[PDB]
């Protein structure tokens, strides 16, 4: 559960003290000095003479155009957290301002705790300076290695979705979400503005969006900064916000005059937020206007105004590095030396090199710190889900009526299971879906919870299962759902989210980024505890898009997921639910797991059930298993072909083809691969099937016919070094489809039962079976003409039931 | 060039006639009847008795929740185009309202022209009804097979970007962009609202956004419909629009009263647009507020109000199909019969079954029609680029100083070439980039054009190369850039767009969709003429992300591009520019091509040049070629290894390793693969290298060491059936990186020169070369410790120049 920390939502009821703002100004100066020492210096952190070009880095990498503004905001937020005792997580949208975050971690004392070799003295300062963006050092962005970070910020557009996710079901947590003005042009964040219509001020926390409007992107100005102030305020008010505006640094006003002004504006905003929270305890049915801060400052605000006669401060020329070579001229080194001395570090550091005590007296202590806040490290919060007994949801008719029974929909079983998980776990488990929960048949959870909706209600003929609080969030944006769930998991909670297969590509970037958060975490960051897994139910898949057609058919999610399987990280799982029982086993395993991205590919269509629960779990631990009840060959020597399958429709076609093969006396084996990554190379993947086990499943000399859900490229690229891999003949999706009957969909991809039987016959003896092969091939065309003439699939195809049903 | 059609931007200066609105109402009724006959009927289109359940489709697929609103808007737009003679292309954002578009194509006469077997009589109406969403029929969405369509609309969020792209450099074209209210929640379209700050009213056309606010998504209401009207107008005004609002169908007002009211509102909006256009001829430096229409209607507006006691009209229950089974009960069939008779088709069709003449008298004729407009079929507009002589831009120093000369940046050559293409082709070629044109070194085009920017200007110390008109558009959104370019090509123009490699994933969906527009076009749609290719310069690639690090390294674009290579469509090209000359040849070939997606992967870093222009073109036509100047073995028999490469950094490492191999007497071959898809299976890909050519390039028995830009999975999945494929040892990206020196980046991926030399030595004789292998392995660690100690890469690595430089 999310803990209550400090004294939440308290008003100051006093002026901001002068001593605190003294401390805030000194903090800002020292944070800018650290952020510059990191970029430029490799030695001599405190500029003991001789300070020469020997002390400067050979290759200057990093960013400065956002760092002083971030340091300003972070120092003021630190004063605020010390004063109010607020439970606060900062989300840094422009993550390229990494030196700001590392300077915070260093100054609040958490960096030395996490990394003991970076001491708080001259040698520790030298190591801290050298390690930024260095061989064998720390990254340039706001990284998982950086304490106090739940968001990398490298790939832009997801500060707001992550903020609204982090506050969900989390009522005491305050999140200032700093948003770059260039990042605000990206598609994800524009729609992430509208997510205050999906949170409740009573049951969820408060997100304060700080638009960091410094006017410029890389080498280009931002649209928001160059439209009129009337337009900007009108725009933010049309999205349910009260815009506040702060402008600074565009004239010669004294720094204290700026710190004081920001203190009054900040306390005004805090009082509006506290009023909203206090009102929500009585009335939470009508939405408030949350304050949001527009923070207009010059880009690179403390750097030299002009360098080489080019406007540097207040321009895009300060984005990455002013003084691109302070190492190769004497004039640029003098500019750099003057820039470092303009902060007066001589008074901010003591003799031994530690930041002076009066510079950090205004700082929060203990669990209130940014790097120490448990919501930033959501693995220490996390507790296991309390799971219902799986046998309660098993489809038992397979156990007595025989394999292949029924016309059930696989995802309804997961719906019931997830409903009871929600029942056992309220306020820790949440279901997201881009308008598609009821189309993936996960609506059984409406028996115990509602869709959280905080826009207007109009009627009850149209607004069923909607409520101002709920455990089902549903907005038509995959970016929103994925950012919500990722921030939900990163804070310590659990969740599933469902989607159409073809639109998972919309978040290929986001998944990639999350994998990079996991790949980095499992490799080099032990102090970050495991978080829950990102569970993605992929349904309404390529083979059954009757209503939509070719635009909704693209199973390429498997390929993008296969690219993140390296160095024994195991941060990826791709599971194929052949039926409801296998889906139960997969979902149980996935809900128990940690630090992974689990894509469970299950169909919503009426499909037969093949396994019992014990059989499903037994197939699960191996990933691939032989179906002894479907095989006609007792041992590996007898079979004239191995028929392997991965996916519900490929499984159905393999089984129907096996029925026809039985009538011709063909001895074959039947294999089902539930988990794709078990087929990976044994030396590469230590949790994949060993080579002996793989050869036992697939006969070394005998041909293997493989029917696969996605593109066959993904199977062939995975088994390349496996034994008997030359004989594998993968049949997968082949970018051929439309709106048409279900048999046609598999016909045009050469994955129907007739084509599979003909493929197996050709693997054995093309000459002996020539007449039967011809008969099958002309039957495919007759059965297509049947669907054209009559509008539905052939009775031979529709009515087929497996021979193993009693 | 974009043609001027009709009489653009003319005011009516008269009331809308009563006869025209009579026609508009009759059109709306007949369009609704056709849109229902398509979904529900397979026979008896005009309901001659006996009209029985025999006449209804077995499987009812399709959508209705948006179709009557679309028919309303389209009929009114048709009256408008007939009256004003406007050059108009409609972009249908909710593309699942396909029956509306097909009903338009049928009613304006273009459908019979394109498809002669769908006549305009009873049999033709029966075929038109049966073919919708049928085996062997037409798709459900607004498809390339549908005349008058440039946008599929299946995957949501790109109606607005496509509209603003279609009007760019196109001053007489009017685009009403119909936007679904659910689609408006998606991330892409939220930022596509802000694209009126990137178009000029003088040089570009006018986009009118029609928000089709029917209140509901699939099974969920929309955020925009449930916020206050004040908020909605404030929101649209903060984005530079004047909101107009129309509300209809929510009471018992007469249909004519609605058509009249809409006529008046539409002419008011048109007069504001015409005022904007006339003002722009004198003043185009200050941005106007373009009108946008908010079209509030009930979802499924003419369907039965209640079915099964559930609110159907004005609800989300009417999204796909009311009466999910009008075939399986008699009551539902009676509901359907009453629904069809409520339009009074008895007076809309004549005896022979044609739509009556007075129903379509108000319709536009000739080139003004939606299905006949040349901007919808942008292949008939298209003309070839006038290309500068390639030899003008060749890097000639390779020809005299020897291969491997220099430290040039490859993309600057493309910058100059593209600059001269822009010079020869203004107002037909355009450069897009998500804030990254100057970071990919394409800024040479600023010598002949400017960045188009129509927000505010503040200074000239920061606003260089910006102008209210230009051929370089640059917004920080990959969705925006890709939609702009796709609508630019679909209208008949040409373009390039550049991006970081890691963020191309942001548009994996969009590329997929465009490939589906091309796969469908090259297979079954001959009447659609070829459009220019989508040219994507992928730069700032994985191997040289010094400033950014792990968050900016993901070369997975190659994998998603490989999934669209089927059935000899050739709609995909993946090219690796090994140096500037190869880049010139690739870019020339790509600019000449049609109906393709060409990803050109080129580095912006200082890299050596290896080929002359003639050599580069000679490598180009084959895709892969042997470097005879780098090989030490004269024939295929002598070589003890083949070193193949694809990519500038892999090429550099192969060449440096070849230098070390030369010192040990190893006989080897050197191969460079410029085009990835030539390595594909010969039987699958008729334009790939034949099997004999492939075996000639790669020795059958000899091991092949392959250094590859992207993940090795993509190489292994492509050569699976090729000869000698067992001996291939692909070395690619392995998700291991950070901010560090360039040698470290290739060190941690086992793709550096030392590791490649050791790999080749192990392929030959591990025992004989054991000491040398050990020496190489410990040198890698020494050269990494050098970078850690000193901050830059080893002199042995940095200073290395190929031995072939004179
Ligand atoms: C989607 C995406 N496209 C491009 C980039 C490359 N990039 C890194 S930083 C940056 C500019 C930062 O813009 P803004 O939000 O205005 O930041 P600030 O002014 O704080 O530097 C860009 C385009 C990215 N990180 N993500
Ligand atoms: C990105 C994306 N996510 C999901 C879908 C699935 N989908 C198809 S139609 C639809 C609802 C249409 O919403 P809206 O724009 O409100 O349309 P309308 O009210 O006109 O039906 C959805 C979610 C999609 N096409 N694209
Ligand atoms: Mg900015
Ligand atoms: Mg809608």
Numbering used by the authors:
A (entry chain A), B (entry chain B): 2 to 807
Study text:
Phosphoketolase (XPK) belongs to the transketolase family, a member of thiamine pyrophosphate (TPP)-dependent enzyme superfamily. It converts F6P, xylulose-5-phosphate (Xu5P) or sedoheptulose-7-phosphate (S7P), which are intermediates in RuBP regeneration, to produce acetyl phosphate (AcP) and C3, C4 or C5 sugar phosphates. XPK is an enzyme present in many microorganisms, primarily involved in substrate-level phosphorylation to produce AcP.
On the other hand, Bifidobacterium longum XPK showed no inhibition by ATP. As the donut-shape or four-leaf clover shape-like particles or two-dimensional (2D) class average images were not in perfect symmetry, we further examined whether the assigned symmetries were pseudosymmetry. Some relative random motions were observed between different dimers in both SeXPK dodecamer and B. longum octamer assemblies, suggesting the likelihood of pseudosymmetry in these structures. Comparison between the C-terminal interfaces of free SeXPK and free B. longum XPK structures provides a structural basis for the lack of ATP inhibition in B. longum XPK.
